[PDB]
Design a protein around this ligand. Structure first.
Ligand code: HEM
Length: 291
């Protein structure tokens, strides 16, 4: 399999910037969602999920084909709750129908991040919708009840090393877990709609208590009212992960640089960018444009 990036016919930077602005304006307006968290989080999750199905071995999965739009994928149990981000984007797609699905799902993720004060994430267009039969089977997304070995192992399928994994996981500071969705419940910290290194701080400074929740699943709960999944917790159990957590707990910039590179890589896995391809775009935030 080769997925070559193909620019949507005749579109350019400015075209993309408008999709971005549209997404951002909607994020701004629909702030009541999930009790005032806003849709930032969910979109980030969405972007990650359409991309985590990737298999470095045979190049199936990944964000290129927008397969999430098909039943198989859309109905994947690991994707429960994502339908709300989809619905959020639907009107957008209506407004700019020439954008591919994979471009759109991934763009929301980027938009989200940057709108929530995170770092700028360069992004590339070119994804191409693929047929229903390209939709990967369910089960390619990781489980939360495991440990560090699982995580290392899992992420390797995506070519991500230890540093990437830890950076990437720092997104856990956002939003929260929801009972109905994954059998987990609770936020991980206080600023759950603004992008910070809070994740790492929490993991290191709170006093975590292992407990079972209402779905009969175990989770690490803190006095402050926060939670961490076992997979999150596992970043402190592994010596190698641990030193990284510590690094980011100490330097928000490092964290941002690292996250930025990783997230893009994550969203570009399995895609071949030809030579003539435009460079990656760096979008302006609403605020940068005074809108
Ligand atoms: C071991 C790896 C991962 C596991 C097992 C994990 C699994 C989960 C779980 C169980 C949920 C809660 C869903 C719900 O009930 O709403 C979720 C929340 C979330 N996931 Fe992950 N995830 C991990 C990797 C990632 C990474 C790489 C990203 C993005 C870079 C990410 C971003 C998020 C976000 C932003 C939320 C909050 C969603 C909301 O507020 O609706 N996670 N994670």
């Amino acid at each position: 399999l080769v997925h070559v990036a193909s620019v949507e016919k005749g579109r350019s930077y400015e075209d993309f910037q408008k999709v971005y602005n549209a997404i951002a304006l909607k994020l701004r307006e629909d702030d009541e969602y999930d009790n005032y968290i806003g849709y930032g989080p969910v979109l980030v999750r969405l972007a990650w999920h359409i991309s985590g199905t990737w298999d470095k071995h045979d190049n199936t999965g990944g964000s290129y084909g927008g397969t999430y739009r098909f039943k198989k994928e859309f109905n994947d149990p690991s994707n429960a709750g994502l339908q709300n981000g989809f619905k959020f984007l639907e009107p957008i797609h209506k407004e700019f129908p020439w954008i591919s699905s994979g471009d759109l799902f991934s763009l929301g993720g980027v938009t989200a991040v940057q709108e929530m004060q995170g770092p700028k994430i360069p992004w590339r267009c070119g994804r191409v919708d693929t047929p229903e039969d390209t939709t990967p089977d369910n089960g390619r997304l990781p489980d939360a009840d495991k440990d560090a070995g699982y995580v290392r192992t899992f992420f390797q399928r995506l070519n991500m090393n230890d540093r990437e994994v830890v950076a990437l996981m720092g997104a856990h500071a956002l939003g929260k877990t929801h009972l109905k969705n994954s059998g987990y419940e609770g936020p991980g910290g206080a600023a759950n709609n603004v992008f910070t290194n809070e994740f790492y701080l929490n993991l290191l400074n709170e006093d975590w208590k292992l407990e079972k929740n209402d779905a009969n699943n175990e989770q690490w709960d803190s006095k402050s009212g926060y939670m961490m999944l076992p997979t999150d917790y596992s970043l402190i159990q592994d010596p190698k992960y641990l030193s990284i957590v510590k690094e980011y707990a100490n330097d928000q910039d490092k964290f941002f640089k690292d996250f930025s590179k990783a997230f893009e890589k994550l969203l570009e896995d399995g895609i071949t960018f030809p030579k003539d391809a435009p460079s990656p775009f760096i979008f302006k935030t609403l605020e940068e444009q005074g809108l």
